[PDB]
Amino acid sequence: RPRFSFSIAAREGKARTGTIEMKRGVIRTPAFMPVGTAATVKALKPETVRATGADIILGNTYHLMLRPGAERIAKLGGLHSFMGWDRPILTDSGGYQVMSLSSLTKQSEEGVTFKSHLDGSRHMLSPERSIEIQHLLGSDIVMAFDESTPYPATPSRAASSMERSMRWAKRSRDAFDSRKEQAENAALFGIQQGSVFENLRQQSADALAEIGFDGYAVGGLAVGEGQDEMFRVLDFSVPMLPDDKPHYLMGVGKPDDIVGAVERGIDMFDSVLPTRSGRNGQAFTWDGPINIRNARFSEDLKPLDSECCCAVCQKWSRAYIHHLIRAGEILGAMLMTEHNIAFYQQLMQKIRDSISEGRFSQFAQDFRARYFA
């Protein structure tokens, strides 16, 4: 297999379906990536993640650098060996979680220093150090290090952070390219910034394409703006990116967000919703989400979802899972999470098949009618 090859097999409107070939495996697109926080997709063995249909998972650099540590993971053979997942892994840059989770942060044109939220130890991230940590982990897809822009942002602040992000994108590119083993075996994605402002999004797209990346994320969304605004920004933002590379919407999201984002040209997604919502008692079904803690499920012998092909829905009832979650049982988290990840993978499969068959627009309409009935 090549280091990186993205091939589009079929299109319908702005939607695409195809494959990314990498050394550790093939990724079918549109793709959903389960989130593997600190070297575990919570409550699942990696074989179970694979069994649900996932081709690639995400790792959180911020969490991994704090515990167990990036150099330690490298000493132990890399993230794949450590956690037992041998297929591709995408790592974020760590910068977003520094902003949202750490303390005592000091930002500058060079990078950021911050205090761990676990024990107050001091740490640093920069374009160079982020790329280096992602190398130490052995990541297959490396995200450039950028500067997040809060929602809402003024035009001036959005421009300043977008401009810095583009300078940091060049530094990330150069750091990645200077490390032979990383440049030859991994891929590097850049992140478009610019908030809700069309002209900034265009400048950002132009700058990233001039540098050149293996894929392009739409950054700065899913941070408080609401679905209407997110879709409006995607409407004009995704067409600015190179058509022949993957388009990644970071941190999205709900099933209906994913469908609408594919309709607007997105190829890749990640979200903690199926895992985190699952542990809290929310199960996704084709008839919308349900809260399994609700007393109406206490004697319900049906599976979580009537059509789902996952092993949980083959074997256990709503009534049983209701009991487990109410009781705080680990198996409740395990079963809810496996079903939710499998549901998300079945959604991506139906999206891929409907695009290949030229009936995705109808699928999206039917999906929404039933999901929101």
8 Å CB contact between 61 and 133: yes
Q: Is 353 annotated as a binding residue?
A: no
| Beta carbons of 194 and 201 less than 8 angstroms apart | yes
Nearer to its own copies, 77 or 226 (CB): 77
- Report if residue 304 touches its own copies, rule: CB under 8 A: no
User: Residue 74 touches which of Zn ion, Cl ion, its own copies, none (CB < 5 to 8 A by kind)?
Assistant: none
Position 8 contacts Cl ion (CB under 5 A) = no
Residue 309 assigned ligand-binding role = no
Chain Cα centroid distance, residue 124: 23
Residue 276 interaction partner, one of Cl ion, its own copies, Zn ion, none, beta carbon < 5-8 Å per kind = Cl ion
Among 55, 267, 270, 305, the active-site one is 270
Are 144 and 218 in contact by the 8 Å Cβ rule? The answer is: no
Q: Candidates 75-83, 191-199, 240-248, 352-360 — which segment interacts with its own copies by CB under 8 A?
A: 75-83
How big is the site for Cl ion, counted in residues (CB under 5 A)?
4
Find out whether 310 is annotated in a ligand binding site: yes
Question: DSSP code of 35?
Answer: B
Site membership for its own copies, residue 82 (CB under 8 A):
yes
Q: If binding is defined by CB under 5 A, does position 308 make contact with Zn ion? A: yes
The verdict on 302 binding its own copies (CB under 8 A) reads no
Q: What is the DSSP string of 287-307?
A: T--EETTSGGGTT--S-SSSS
Nearer to its own copies, 85 or 367 (CB): 85
Does 272 engage in binding with Cl ion (CB under 5 A)?
A: yes
Count, residues near Zn ion per rule CB under 5 A: 5
Catalytic residue, chosen from 55, 92, 214, 305, is 92
User: Is 93 labelled as part of a ligand binding site?
Assistant: yes
- What are the tokens at 213? 């990346």
Distance from C-alpha of 196 to C-alpha of 204, rounded to nearest angstrom: 12
| Nearer to its own copies (CB atom), residue 29 or residue 139 | 139
Q: Is 94 annotated as a binding residue?
A: yes
Checking 285-291 for CB contacts under 8 A at 24+ apart, the result is 285/343, 286/367, 286/370, 286/371, 287/370, 287/371, 287/373, 288/371, 288/372, 288/373
Helices 318-326/330-356 angle, 10° precision:
130
247: phi then psi, degrees, rounded to nearest 5? -115, 120
Is residue 68 a contact point for its own copies (CB under 8 A)? Answer: yes
Tokens 């990116």 appear where? 241
Residue 204, φ and ψ in degrees, nearest 5: -65, -45
Give CA–CA dist 319/290, Å, rounded. 13
The sign one gets for the Cα dihedral 289, 13, 227, 221 is positive
Under the criterion CB under 5 A, does residue 11 sit at the interface with Cl ion? no
Tell me the per-residue interface mask from 103 to 132 with its own copies, x by CB under 8 A, - otherwise: ------------------------------
92 catalytic? Reply is yes
Binding-site ranges for its own copies (CB under 8 A): 38-40, 42-45, 67-68, 72, 75-77, 82-84, 298-299, 301, 315-317, 319-320, 323-324, 326-327, 329-331, 333-334
Annotated binding site for substrate: 92-96, 146, 193, 220
Residues assigned a catalytic role: 92, 270
Binding-site ranges for Zn ion (CB under 5 A): 308, 310, 312-313, 339
